[PDB]
Curated annotation (Swiss-Prot), chain B:
<comment type="function">
    <text>Downstream effector molecule involved in the transmission of signals from tyrosine kinase receptors and small GTPases to the actin cytoskeleton. Promotes formation of actin filaments. Part of the WAVE complex that regulates lamellipodia formation. The WAVE complex regulates actin filament reorganization via its interaction with the Arp2/3 complex. As component of the WAVE1 complex, required for BDNF-NTRK2 endocytic trafficking and signaling from early endosomes. Also involved in the regulation of mitochondrial dynamics.</text>
</comment>
<comment type="similarity">
    <text>Belongs to the SCAR/WAVE family.</text>
</comment>
<comment type="subunit">
    <text>Component of the WAVE1 complex composed of ABI2, CYFIP1 or CYFIP2, BRK1, NCKAP1 and WASF1/WAVE1. Within the complex, a heterodimer containing NCKAP1 and CYFIP1 interacts with a heterotrimer formed by WAVE1, ABI2 and BRK1. CYFIP2 binds to activated RAC1 which causes the complex to dissociate, releasing activated WASF1. The complex can also be activated by NCK1. Binds actin and the Arp2/3 complex. Interacts with BAIAP2. Interacts with SHANK3; the interaction mediates the association of SHANK3 with the WAVE1 complex. Interacts with ABI1 (via N-terminus).</text>
</comment>
<protein>
    <recommendedName>
        <fullName>Actin-binding protein WASF1</fullName>
    </recommendedName>
</protein>
UniProtKB/Swiss-Prot annotation, chain D:
<dbReference type="GO" id="GO:2000601">
    <property type="term" value="P:positive regulation of Arp2/3 complex-mediated actin nucleation"/>
</dbReference>
<dbReference type="GO" id="GO:0044877">
    <property type="term" value="F:protein-containing complex binding"/>
</dbReference>
<dbReference type="GO" id="GO:0048144">
    <property type="term" value="P:fibroblast proliferation"/>
</dbReference>
<comment type="subunit">
    <text>Homotrimer when in free form. Directly interacts with WASF2. Component of the WAVE1 complex composed of ABI2, CYFIP1 or CYFIP2, BRK1, NCKAP1 and WASF1/WAVE1. Within the complex, a heterodimer containing NCKAP1 and CYFIP1 interacts with a heterotrimer formed by WAVE1, ABI2 and BRK1.</text>
</comment>
<dbReference type="GO" id="GO:0005856">
    <property type="term" value="C:cytoskeleton"/>
</dbReference>
<protein>
    <recommendedName>
        <fullName>Protein BRICK1</fullName>
    </recommendedName>
</protein>
<dbReference type="GO" id="GO:0010592">
    <property type="term" value="P:positive regulation of lamellipodium assembly"/>
</dbReference>
Swiss-Prot record, chain F:
<protein>
    <recommendedName>
        <fullName>Cytoplasmic FMR1-interacting protein 1</fullName>
    </recommendedName>
</protein>
<comment type="similarity">
    <text>Belongs to the CYFIP family.</text>
</comment>
<comment type="subunit">
    <text>Component of the WAVE1 complex composed of ABI2, CYFIP1 or CYFIP2, BRK1, NCKAP1 and WASF1/WAVE1. Within the complex, a heterodimer containing NCKAP1 and CYFIP1 interacts with a heterotrimer formed by WAVE1, ABI2 and BRK1. Component of the CYFIP1-EIF4E-FMR1 complex which is composed of CYFIP, EIF4E and FMR1. Interacts with FMR1 but does not bind to related proteins FXR1 or FXR2. Interaction with EIF4E stimulates FMR1 binding. Component of the WAVE2 complex composed of ABI1, CYFIP1/SRA1, NCKAP1/NAP1 (NCKAP1l/HEM1 in hematopoietic cells) and WASF2/WAVE2.</text>
</comment>
<comment type="function">
    <text>Component of the CYFIP1-EIF4E-FMR1 complex which binds to the mRNA cap and mediates translational repression. In the CYFIP1-EIF4E-FMR1 complex this subunit is an adapter between EIF4E and FMR1. Promotes the translation repression activity of FMR1 in brain probably by mediating its association with EIF4E and mRNA. Regulates formation of membrane ruffles and lamellipodia. Plays a role in axon outgrowth. Binds to F-actin but not to RNA. Part of the WAVE complex that regulates actin filament reorganization via its interaction with the Arp2/3 complex.</text>
</comment>
Length: 46, 85, 53, 62, 231, 79
């Protein structure tokens, strides 16, 4: 029910023996860039 | 807040990843259980066989043994299993 | 999100522990069987040598 | 400011994801170990079975 | 170390792919190779008879080394991720909170609003104030020289900046150094621009290293060694 | 792999029991019996986790079956 308890559970899980492993104006630019990327995802699919 | 909306979406995706991990554990555990249960069946069957063999062997009698020279090759020869996967 | 993770970890740990214990139990029983079978084989070949004598 | 709260939330999300990766790696390791042990058990059982059959074939007439 | 390993894996993959492609594009013939029969398909001469025993052994050794290094690097996923993200956060915060101070002060002092606006945007986009707000006693903002000083405590946590934030900061930062741009570069001193270029060239691989697993798997792609649709 | 492993092991076993004085005499006379080159098959023999398309293959079991068949065939041939 708390973050500390969950972290502890993970540590406990990790503590097991496992032998025998192996032997501005920039907004417009961002929008255009996003559009280009979207177009590219489709070109790769084609 | 857009940032607050993003964090909520990230938490939902994290819950979905937790479910995916649950399924990545469940399938492995089920396969392990199935194979170990088959192994347990084999072990129990061979344990029954072993106790039967022991109770049979503890009754042998050297004087009862009779050797037939004529039947020595008339007898079917024993061959071990040679199954290859 | 914090809760669910703890529950999943606990279940995995318990299940993993159970599986490990099952394997250990099986291996030990197999080892025990191997000893009885060896005793049986010793008795069998002793009887065969007695018959030969 | 919203930026600090976003950074803290990004800390939280990253910690959760790291824990997920820990669990996943552990699961993979468990799968790797358990299987090797199972293979050994299976081979031992197989050896016992054949040996038992040989003992049986050796102590029976017809 | 992680950067060097990724670069080495990429170099090995590039070498393997280049040699494979060159062999594919240059099929042999019975005149050159005696083992090749008179009758054979294009793929036959291209691949089967186009490699020597030593070449095949070298390819196998390179592939095995690549995969061994891949697994070894994967074993240290958590440590590499934590170290990379902590380093990225520390560098970004220290830069945006210390290195931009002198330039900002100079701009304010000489009334350079164009530089001041972008510098303030950069310092507002990424900087995380441990106190919850920008300091008010900073002498750089007022434009007058700092005493002797004015120690500022930069916080430390392990998290990489978001893709949008990193791209935005980089775009603003490399606009000041732009020769073409009246050039903004002409309004900045030498040491400040040198530090800015150093930071810009160093921060190129932040996005790649943040997604360490995807980058590592991409740098070791060998799936193109089996498909034969073209032939 | 199983065939070559069995052949190499049988050759090594045969060479081990060969008289050393006879080998020295043959070498002196000019009829040296070439020794079998060493190999690292043990690494493959100790492999139980061969992963291929999501399948775990116990190579050791298959090699064991093949060597058992080869040994039975060799014993029958000797008899």
């Amino acid at each position: 029910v708390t973050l500390e308890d969950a972290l502890s559970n993970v540590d406990l899980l990790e503590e097991l023996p496992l032998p025998d492993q192996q032997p501005a104006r920039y907004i417009e630019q961002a929008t255009v860039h996003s559009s280009m990327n979207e177009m590219l995802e489709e070109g790769q699919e084609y | 807040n857009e940032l607050e909306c993003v964090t909520n979406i990230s938490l939902a995706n994290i819950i979905r990843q937790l479910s995916s991990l649950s399924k990545y554990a469940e399938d492995i555990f089920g396969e392990l259980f199935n194979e170990a249960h088959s192994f347990s069946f084999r072990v129990n069957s061979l344990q029954e066989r072993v106790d039967r063999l022991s109770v049979s062997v503890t009754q042998l009698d050297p004087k009862e043994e009779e050797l037939s020279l004529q039947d020595i090759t008339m007898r079917k020869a024993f061959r071990s299993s040679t199954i290859q996967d | 999100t914090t809760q669910s993770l703890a529950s999943v970890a606990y279940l995995i740990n318990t299940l993993a522990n159970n599986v490990l214990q099952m394997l250990d139990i099986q291996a030990s029983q197999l080892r025990r069987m191997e000893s009885s079978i060896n005793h049986i084989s010793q008795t069998v070949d002793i009887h065969k040598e007695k018959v030969a004598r | 400011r919203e930026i600090h709260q976003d950074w803290a939330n990004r800390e939280y999300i990253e910690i959760i994801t790291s824990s997920i990766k820990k669990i996943a790696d552990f699961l993979n390791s468990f799968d790797m170990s358990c299987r090797s042990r199972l293979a050994t058990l299976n081979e031992k059982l197989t050896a016992l079975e054949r040996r038992i059959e040989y003992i049986e074939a050796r102590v029976t007439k017809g | 170390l992680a950067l060097q390993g990724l670069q080495l894996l990429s170099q090995w993959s590039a070498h393997v792919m280049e040699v494979y492609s060159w062999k594919l594009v240059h099929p042999t013939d019975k005149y050159s190779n005696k083992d090749c029969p008179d009758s054979a398909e294009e793929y036959e001469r291209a691949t089967r008879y186009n490699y020597t025993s030593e070449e095949k052994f070298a390819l196998v050794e390179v592939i095995a080394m690549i995969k061994g290094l891949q697994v070894l690097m994967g074993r240290m996923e958590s440590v590499f991720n934590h170290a990379i993200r902590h380093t990225v956060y520390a560098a970004l915060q220290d830069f945006s909170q210390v290195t931009l101070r002198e330039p900002l002060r100079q701009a304010i002092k000489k009334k350079k609003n164009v530089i001041q606006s972008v510098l303030q945007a950069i310092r507002k986009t990424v900087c995380d104030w441990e106190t919850g707000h920008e300091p008010f006693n900073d002498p750089a903002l007022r434009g007058e020289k700092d005493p002797k000083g004015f120690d500022i405590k930069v916080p430390r946590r392990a998290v990489g900046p978001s893709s949008t934030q990193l791209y935005m900061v980089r775009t603003m930062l490399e606009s000041l150094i732009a020769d073409k741009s009246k050039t903004l570069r002409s309004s900045l001193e030498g040491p400040t621009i040198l530090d800015i270029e150093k930071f810009h060239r160093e921060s190129f691989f932040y996005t790649h290293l943040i997604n360490f697993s995807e980058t590592l798997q991409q740098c070791c792609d060998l799936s193109q060694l089996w498909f034969r649709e073209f032939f | 792999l199983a065939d070559q492993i069995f052949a190499y092991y049988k050759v090594m076993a045969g060479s081990l029991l060969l008289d050393k004085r006879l080998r020295s005499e043959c070498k002196n006379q000019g009829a040296t019996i070439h020794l079998p080159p060493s190999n690292r098959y043990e690494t493959l023999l100790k492999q139980r986790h061969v992963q291929l398309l999501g399948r775990s293959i116990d190579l050791n079991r298959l090699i064991t079956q093949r060597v058992s068949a080869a040994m039975y065939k060799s014993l029958e041939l000797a008899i």
